[PDB]
Design an enzyme around this catalytic site. Sequence first.
Site, PDB file in Angstrom:
ATOM      1  N   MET A   1       8.507   0.919   0.023  1.00  0.00           N
ATOM      2  CA  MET A   1       7.329   1.126   0.561  1.00  0.00           C
ATOM      3  C   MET A   1       7.319   0.296   1.914  1.00  0.00           C
ATOM      4  O   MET A   1       7.657  -1.032   2.038  1.00  0.00           O
ATOM      5  CB  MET A   1       6.265   0.467  -0.148  1.00  0.00           C
ATOM      6  N   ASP A   2       6.882   0.978   3.083  1.00  0.00           N
ATOM      7  CA  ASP A   2       6.879   0.321   4.410  1.00  0.00           C
ATOM      8  C   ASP A   2       5.508  -0.118   4.556  1.00  0.00           C
ATOM      9  O   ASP A   2       4.740  -0.410   3.527  1.00  0.00           O
ATOM     10  CB  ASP A   2       7.383   1.392   5.497  1.00  0.00           C
ATOM     11  N   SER A   3       5.027  -0.521   5.767  1.00  0.00           N
ATOM     12  CA  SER A   3       3.940  -1.182   6.139  1.00  0.00           C
ATOM     13  C   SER A   3       2.629  -0.209   5.558  1.00  0.00           C
ATOM     14  O   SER A   3       1.764  -0.671   4.752  1.00  0.00           O
ATOM     15  CB  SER A   3       3.734  -1.340   7.552  1.00  0.00           C
TER      16      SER A   3
END
Lengths: 175, 115, 155, 137, 359, 93, 80
Positions: free
Chosen positions: F39-41
């Site tokens: 998961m990114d930002s």
Amino acid sequence: YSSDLPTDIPVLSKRPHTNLLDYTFTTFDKMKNWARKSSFWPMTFGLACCAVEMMHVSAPRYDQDRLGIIFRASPRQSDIMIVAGTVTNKMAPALRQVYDQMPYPRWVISMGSCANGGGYYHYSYSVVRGVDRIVPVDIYVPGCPPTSEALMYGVFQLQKKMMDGQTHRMWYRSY
Amino acid sequence: TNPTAFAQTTRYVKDSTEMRTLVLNLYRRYLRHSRGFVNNYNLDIPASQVRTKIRQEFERQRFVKDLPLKNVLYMKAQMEFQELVNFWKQQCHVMQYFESIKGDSFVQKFLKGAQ
Amino acid sequence: MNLEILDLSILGFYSLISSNSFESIAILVATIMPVITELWYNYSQLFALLYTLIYVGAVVILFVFILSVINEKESGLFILILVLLLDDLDDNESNDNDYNNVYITDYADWFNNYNESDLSVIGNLLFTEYALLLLIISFILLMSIIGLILIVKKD
Amino acid sequence: MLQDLFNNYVILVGILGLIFLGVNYFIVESPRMDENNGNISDYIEKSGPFECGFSSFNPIPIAFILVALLFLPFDLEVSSMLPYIVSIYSVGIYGLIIFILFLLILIVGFIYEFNTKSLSITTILHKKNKALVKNLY
Amino acid sequence: VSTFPLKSDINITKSGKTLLSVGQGGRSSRTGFTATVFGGTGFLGRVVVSKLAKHGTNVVVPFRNDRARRQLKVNGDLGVVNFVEFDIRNLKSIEDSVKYSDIVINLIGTEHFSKNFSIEDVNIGAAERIAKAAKEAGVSRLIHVSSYNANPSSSSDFYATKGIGEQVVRDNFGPDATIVRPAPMYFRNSPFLNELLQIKALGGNVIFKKEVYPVHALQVGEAIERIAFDDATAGQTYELFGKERYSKKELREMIKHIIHIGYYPYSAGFYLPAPEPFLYAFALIRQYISSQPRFNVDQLKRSHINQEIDQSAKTFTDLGMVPDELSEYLYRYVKPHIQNRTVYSKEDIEKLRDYVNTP
Amino acid sequence: ASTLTKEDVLTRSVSVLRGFEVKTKDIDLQTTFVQDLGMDSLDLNDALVALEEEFDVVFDDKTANEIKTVGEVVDFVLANYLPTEQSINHTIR
Amino acid sequence: MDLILLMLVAVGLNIIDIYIMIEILIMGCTVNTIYSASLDNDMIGLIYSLIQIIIAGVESAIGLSILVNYNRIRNSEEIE
Ligand SMILES: CCCCCCCCCCCCCCCCCC(=O)OC[C@H](COP(=O)(O)OCCN)OC(=O)CCCCCCCCCCCCCCCCC
Ligand SMILES: CCCCCCCCCCCCCCCCCC(=O)OC[C@H](COP(=O)(O)OCCN)OC(=O)CCCCCCCCCCCCCCCCC
Ligand SMILES: NC(=O)C1=CN([C@@H]2O[C@H](COP(=O)(O)OP(=O)(O)OC[C@H]3O[C@@H](n4cnc5c(N)ncnc54)[C@H](OP(=O)(O)O)[C@@H]3O)[C@@H](O)[C@H]2O)C=CC1
Ligand SMILES: CCCCCCCCCCCC(=O)OC[C@H](COP(=O)(O)OCC[N+](C)(C)C)OC(=O)CCCCCCCCCCC
Ligand code: SF4
């Protein structure tokens, strides 16, 4: 099925009274319209320089109160809405909310150039070009600002229309 | 003078890294008020839909590069947050905000009038 | 056909289905009015008025005063009807059958040539015969005036 | 004596109340007659609150709540002087001296609320000022 | 709609007129047509009129109620929306609204006969006079709206007269006329839904057991708009309906459950089991005592008849439009009548629909 | 009182995590967020806000850049769970 | 059907509802007293009724004063 519609029967606004019921429901229409013709209570929707003239009608020289005109602030208590002054885009959504809250019957008067078709500020990025894009209008008073008599003349013409209402005869003859 | 609810001073940020963290908190602030935006403005779309549109809004413009133009984009997005959370925009503007929006061949545009 | 009974039957219904504090307040008024009216006829007219001037005029409009400062949030029909119908079977608060179903009369006398209202007698006794009751009640009202301030006034 | 005439008056006013309710339901033109756009229940725009045009989303002070509570004592005081009104003569001087005592006790209640300034709405949340003083070092 | 409705800027009508549209499709643009929308002041007309005016087509709206035509002028620009006072018994006033018209749309249709008109006199007598009179003035295109269950031999007065309305038009306007059959549309102040929201609905079990194919009124509003600008769709029969099948009783409990309306349904009058003769007698009695259009004897029979799809007709996809389902729009149209608002999304209507069917 | 225990948070945490695109369906205390779930930002914020909607606990700005594992969130809820104050009607009657 | 404590169902579910029930109950004792005083043609009983109305009035004020202070306590944060 069996059907036969005549052709020479006229329209409602031209149809003369024939029997006694056509006189009964004309009495109810005049009596009911006379009540609304006299108790003409607009709403204080002054927005711009046109609002000064709308005050001068209530002034002692003209005295709108003599004709049964008592401005009511709340939309519920007001059966007319004199849109006086420029209707900016930032106001137009708010104007629709005020108009939609008036119980029927309801009339709208557009006073001045700004309310009619844009007026001086017709080429402005934030001015509605005529309030008729937002609310239906029943009479347009031209001026900049219309003189205190011009508004009274516009009020009188709308009164002459209300006295022409034929709702309860319409049920008998057109419905 | 007393500043209004959800106000921030207009500051010219002189760091690349600090702006990154300011934005990240801001994106959460929109998602925290997801339920409110539905109930405040009486939107026809449910809470998950607003978050989906907010994400489509934040995903859209994440690749900007100019720091002097980063602050401007952070400043105005703050105003959009402040206007929306304080319940300032009318109901109609929010409904039309999410109600906005493939092309056609040259023959199709030639016939009707193109642009 | 005593129409007083029907009104209480209605009140005996909205009391069971009362949901929010609007309903409960309206129960108080809808209890006072059958009290006031049944006293205006029948037994005592003076106290039918003394109810309205004090109950409604002092406490009930103080009930709705505080209630606006409190909060405004938020079986079936056959059971409620069944409860009322069984509750309505017996309505004789007394059980002296002879005392209930036999009527009586009194004989008027002309001795009291000094006819006066029932309030004049009460004043003639409460202010002379039972003055202590009056002076204690004044003392109680004094306690409340000092009592009500100390509870509410934060400072 | 004899209030049959008053009774009929009470009946008439009650009957007259329904006439205020019912006359509107019969005189007004039906929704289809004016604009037909919708019934009162359906016309949510009209059947809604008024907030000067713009849509929006009583914690009254202590004094306002305190004035209301203090109405209950003082009203029971006044409404308990009724017996003395209809019997001011017969009780004579003895009732008059008792009556004055019944007030002097309640005057102390009046005196007490006067001194503490319990009735005043009061303004403590704001209107504060200070004098600027140099702090030379 | 989008940005410009016309397929091509220049369109030639069946009468040889060469109409050139101008502008980019805004309020101040034009299309060179003149679409007379009979019965425009009604529920369906206010959608037909609105779409035609905003895109620049002149609309001539013949009315019999003076105070209901005022709001139709907002949609168009100056001179776009025109008004003619008329009655179906005034032939001359009919010919005032068709003299300059290149499109004539018929929407007049009633369910209750009055002290001045019968069901036949409107679904036929109005339609026959309107269609035949339009032809004599060289009207290029006629579009008609009938019931969704038109049948010449039906025992229901509404369906019998509406079916004969299809025949009598085609014997008067000719091969050019078109017939469109709309399913019960749902929209703001829709007569289809106004019966479901009413709390005191006597004979609610009997009235609501009927079956339907609800269609979004906006699409039907655009359905006539698509047909209006096209000459390829003359002489056809169109039946417009929604994919997912719903019944009134399924909707009535689905509607009530969204409004969250214990003891209350049993008392306020939601379910009023009344004898069949009483319903028949009550409708007859009001028919001479009422003054506003009430529940009619005809709708007592229609409640026993379910909606029938006719295979000889053409669906929405014939016009390139995919019909929308009541699931995606049922919540918003009753949102006026409904802590934290629960928005019943498109998929979640089934889960509501599940809760109704579970005993 | 705070009726949430560590297991109760952990059991209901997975269901929210099973509602979002996760590289592996095996999530426990040791499982990370950025690494294990990829998961990114923006992706991670939705899950973190989602746990705020179910556990009803607000995460501050200090912990924003300091979250690295899913056990920390589960343990964080216990330290920061309170029942909303009930009005005078609910409490005593 | 009072021995099954039916009146408890008729009471509302707030503290303000309990206050109402008490005043109704006290009002029942005054109506009985006025019933007894009038039939006996006794003005001593009507004095008792006047005292019951006055005394029960004070009790109403003290109860609401406590309730108002109690309700203010929850919303007594006063941070701004
Ligand atoms: C002049 C008479 C006018 C009567 C207006 C109300 C008529 C309805 C019948 C009420 C009287 C029965 C006695 C019970 C007291 C009222 C308690 C109550 O629950 O009222 C219910 C009233 C109607 O609403 P409803 O739908 O029936 O109930 C569910 C509402 N969510 O919803 C309400 O909460 C009432 C809202 C208005 C409150 C005004 C004050 C109460 C009425 C005081 C004057 C009436 C005196 C009592 C008359 C009957 C005596 C038995
Ligand atoms: C259409 C009719 C409508 C009538 C409305 C009321 C319907 C009935 C409702 C329930 C009635 C139960 C109570 C009955 C009346 C109270 C008792 C009483 O007064 O006596 C009657 C009955 C027999 O009395 P009896 O021997 O005949 O006296 C003649 C003397 N010459 O006495 C009895 O023996 C009754 C048996 C009672 C003993 C068992 C129950 C008591 C134990 C449970 C009590 C519940 C908990 C209470 C705890 C107390 C709190 C500290
Ligand atoms: N979802 C729906 O509403 C349904 C659609 N239909 C049919 O579609 C057609 C469109 O009607 P719709 O708008 O939906 O409902 P409406 O009944 O409101 O439309 C009636 C329109 O025709 C006019 N009208 C009726 N009788 C007369 C008459 N004697 N003389 C002149 N005008 C008359 C009305 O005039 P005015 O209103 O100004 O008095 C109005 O303009 C109807 O035939 C309808 O039965 C089928 C089932 C349900
Ligand atoms: C019991 C219920 C409460 C009281 C009811 C009365 C309220 C007030 C009524 C207002 C009436 C009104 O407005 O009448 C005045 C209007 C104004 O004329 P106009 O509108 O320009 O049309 C008139 C011109 N025409 C028709 C040529 C276009 O018509 C009239 O001249 C009606 C004709 C006069 C009637 C006189 C005879 C009847 C007398 C009845 C009384 C004994
Ligand atoms: S029309 Fe003229 S006077 Fe009226 S608001 Fe506009 S500028 Fe002012």
